[PDB]
Design a protein around this nucleic acid. Structure first.
Lengths: 536, 83, 131
RNA sequence: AACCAGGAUGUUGGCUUAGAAGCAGCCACCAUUUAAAGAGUGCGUAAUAGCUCACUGGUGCCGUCGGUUCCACAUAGGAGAG
RNA sequence: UAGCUCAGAGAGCGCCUGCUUUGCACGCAGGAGG
């Protein structure tokens, strides 16, 4: 996302605000991120320098994110050498993802001194390095680089500074003179021709479809500061630029400054990334156990197919009992009429009396019947976990991060994993009511059992997986009855479904029947479908 | 302390096994003499290292058995790079 | 001497072995029991039977078990599995009094109230209670 | 104590059970005719029958190459095969 | 004695999985930290 064109944009809009700025306080709130408070234009405001490998940027920023309890090692040098210092200049350094700050400072006897601070925004190996402007010595860098990496450059304290290698990419018709008619993937050729540009910009440029007017428009529009600060959403992924986006299929939102763009894009990034990681790491775990339980029924069912037909040993026992007056000790078979009038040749034990032969079939029957009941209760337990994990995965797929932060506790309590007033999350409803719901099972159970009496009307999806939701103690108008279904269909056994019915019931039923199975009685259902965010 | 252990804690090499390997290839000299992986090293010693073509000469300033990551760079200083 | 439902006595499981060990033709007898009995099979009938050495099979239908008349009047599927750790149903003494009048030709009590007391003792066996 | 005689009726109490009828288990343990007789003391039965007894009257090291049966008391020599 | 090797409760590291990927084995977050 952050690009040489964006680097030029920052180099100007910072110099509109930071020219002659006194650095009033420096602090390092995060491992690879450093804040300068700067007094300029009579105002006291924050510049963020970041060399985080994914999220690296230079960024004037509203949010007072944190200030550290620690004074960490790089930060202390910037406090020693450029806090109280005066920012003379900001420069684009060949435009490809580097910014230079030239800064004035004084020594411990008041002699005047000049420092260069280099922020390199080169992706996975972005870095921030401080240097003397007369001697070119690195004082220190936020990341060191030991010369055994054998790169063109070494980054060590007291060694001379250097800029990274230029790619032989030309500074910004001449591309049509390099371009080959056998090349698809044209964004590769555009990025290989021009400096200061990266694949999303080059891909949107290609999607303008010759394209010289497109590239000459873009480079002029950038130089002229004609751009729009823009964020976009492309189903799940979200991106930003100082650009209009040519043909990207997504949503869009715009602002007055690059500061607010970089704020509004990165402020949630750390939490969204942390959660999506841990939430998928819970999803992966539940999938393994749900697979293991479904495979445990697939085991037991085909195993039960080798059980005997208990009804036949029962029926033989009865038939021998009834015939028992005729039989003699140690005939090999009994020819017996069934109580329709077939005759079964029942085989006998040759030494047992005919009584003992009757008891022997009743014993085999009792073993068979017992074994089937034992395997059916194994199947019942595995079915409970299958159903519960179907419901759980519905919820986990559709839960907020805050509601995922409830779910794990129930599974640690469920012993599958290892290690207060609120429950519902609530939104507007028809006839101007307020409707409560919860995506977490224990929270839904605590909401449906206690937001309302027994006599009230309360609701769910009619499918076998759902979220439980209600307006509080309601008996609201038929408009509310027709609106509840859209919230139920935003949280049913499938998303975006076409005809999946809703259900509503008197809360004398919907009591408890693993967790969060409810008993159904006193109930109704209506056909329904998924809906837009207007379902709030 | 040994050379291989010194190159590892000073973060001149990532893996101790490679520090051993490079010294056992003879790509290291101490005080101008070629040096084995076991070689003693002290502050005020000169090391020359062949990182591919890049002949780096460094002097040791400190000795440690453990460090924080940034503090490892504090251990030693370069004096010349050649190729 | 047997207990079998009124009508549908002809199936072999209850009567067949007992007649079998006497040497009696089941489908000779059970057509006549299905003739003499016309009440619903939710009523069990005790039947007394004997054979002469000639295999003249002979029989008398007795009044239903008092525990079955109690079940019908109580409106219950089956009796208490643990009476005095449960109860199942309550009945008016008028029905018990009719049961006494019904069971009287099949009893040793001389007076109606002695028969009502017998029948309530049967009720106490099965968790049925009395108004 | 012996001996003679009775030792019953609702009922196969309910439940449970293939069956479970005093006598596999559980729950109850009422009431009648009484001189007296348990909703039964031990045998017996597949369940019943049957014998009985209370009772009554009489008489280096980590990991899937990388990483520093019923029973408290257990024994056909004949369906046959011997 | 954190998955591992060690220091006193916190340094270094590996693996596996995700993320990030215009720049010459250069990171980051999660399995998790006793």
């Amino acid at each position: 996302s952050f690009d040489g064109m964006f680097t030029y944009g920052m180099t100007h809009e910072l110099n509109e605000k930071i020219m002659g700025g006194r650095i009033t306080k420096i602090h390092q709130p995060y491992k690879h991120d450093v804040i300068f408070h700067i007094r300029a234009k009579g105002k006291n405001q924050k510049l963020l320098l970041s060399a985080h490998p994914s999220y690296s940027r230079v960024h004037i920023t509203a949010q007072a994110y944190e200030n550290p309890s620690e004074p960490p090692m790089f930060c202390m040098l910037l406090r020693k050498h450029i806090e109280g210092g005066f920012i003379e200049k900001i420069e684009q350094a060949g435009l490809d993802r580097i910014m230079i700050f030239h800064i004035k400072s004084r020594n411990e006897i008041g002699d005047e001194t000049v420092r260069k601070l280099y922020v390199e925004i080169m992706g996975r190996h972005s870095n921030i390095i401080l240097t003397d402007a007369a001697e070119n010595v690195i004082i220190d860098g936020l990341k060191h680089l030991s010369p055994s990496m054998n790169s063109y450059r070494t980054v060590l304290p007291g060694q001379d500074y250097k800029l990274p290698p230029a790619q032989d990419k030309i500074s910004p018709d001449d591309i049509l003179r390099h371009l080959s008619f056998q090349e698809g993937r044209l964004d590769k050729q555009i990025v290989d021709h021009f400096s200061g540009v990266s694949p999303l910009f080059a891909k949107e440029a290609v999607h303008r479809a010759t394209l010289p007017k497109a590239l000459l428009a873009l480079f002029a529009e950038v130089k002229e500061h004609r751009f729009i600060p823009n964020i976009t959403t492309v189903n799940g992924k979200e991106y930003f630029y100082l650009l209009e986006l040519t043909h990207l299929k997504g949503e869009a939102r715009r602002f007055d400054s690059l500061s607010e763009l970089l704020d509004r894009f990165y402020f949630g990034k750390a939490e969204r990334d942390r959660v999506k990681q841990q939430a998928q790491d819970l999803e992966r775990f539940v999938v393994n156990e749900r697979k293991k339980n479904a495979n445990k029924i697939k085991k037991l069912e085909k195993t039960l197919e080798y059980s005997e037909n208990a009804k036949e040993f029962q029926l033989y026992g009865e038939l021998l009992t009834a015939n028992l007056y005729m039989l003699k000790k140690g005939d090999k078979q009994a020819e017996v009429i069934n109580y329709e009038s077939p005759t079964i040749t029942i085989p006998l034990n040759p030494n047992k009396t005919p009584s003992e032969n009757a008891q022997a079939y009743f014993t085999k029957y009792q073993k068979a019947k017992n074994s089937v009941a034992v395997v059916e209760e194994q199947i019942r337990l595995a079915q409970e976990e299958i159903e519960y994990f179907d419901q759980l995965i519905q919820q986990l797929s559709s839960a907020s991060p805050r509601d995922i932060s409830e779910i794990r506790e129930e599974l640690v309590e469920g012993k599958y994993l290892r290690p207060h007033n609120p429950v519902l999350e609530t939104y507007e409803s028809t006839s101007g009511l307020t409707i409560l719901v919860g995506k977490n099972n224990r929270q839904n159970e605590y909401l449906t059992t206690r937001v309302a009496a027994r006599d009230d009307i309360w609701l769910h999806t009619k499918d076998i997986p759902g979220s439980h939701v209600v307006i509080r103690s309601s008996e609201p108008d038929e408009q509310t009855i027709m609106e509840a279904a859209t919230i139920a269909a935003y949280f049913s056994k499938a998303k975006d479904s076409s005809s999946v019915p809703v259900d509503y019931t008197k809360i004398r039923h919907v009591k408890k029947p693993k967790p969060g199975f409810v008993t159904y009685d006193s109930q109704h259902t209506v056909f329904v479908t998924p809906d837009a965010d207007t379902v709030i | 302390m040994r050379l291989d252990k010194f190159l590892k804690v000073s973060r001149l090499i990532k893996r101790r096994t490679l520090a051993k390997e490079v010294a056992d290839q003879g790509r290291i000299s101490i005080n101008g003499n070629q040096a084995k992986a076991s070689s003693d090293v002290k502050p005020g010693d000169e090391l020359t290292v062949r990182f591919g073509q890049k002949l780096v000469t460094v002097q040791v300033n400190e000795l440690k058995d453990t460090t924080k990551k940034e503090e490892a760079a504090n251990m030693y200083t370069i004096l010349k790079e050649e190729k | 001497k047997l207990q079998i439902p009124a009508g549908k006595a002809n199936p072999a499981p209850p009567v067949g072995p007992a007649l079998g060990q006497a040497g009696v033709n089941i489908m000779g007898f059970c057509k006549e029991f299905n003739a003499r009995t016309a009440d619903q099979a939710g009523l069990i009938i005790p039947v007394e039977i004997s054979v002469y050495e000639d295999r003249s099979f002979t029989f008398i239908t007795k009044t239903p078990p008092a525990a079955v008349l109690l079940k019908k009047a109580a409106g219950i599927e089956s009796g208490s599995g643990e009476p005095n750790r449960n109860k199942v149903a309550t009945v008016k003494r008028d029905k018990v009094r009719e049961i006494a009048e019904t069971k009287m030709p099949d009893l040793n009590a001389a007076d109606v109230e002695a028969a009502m007391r017998m029948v309530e003792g049967t009720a106490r066996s099965m968790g049925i209670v009395i108004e």
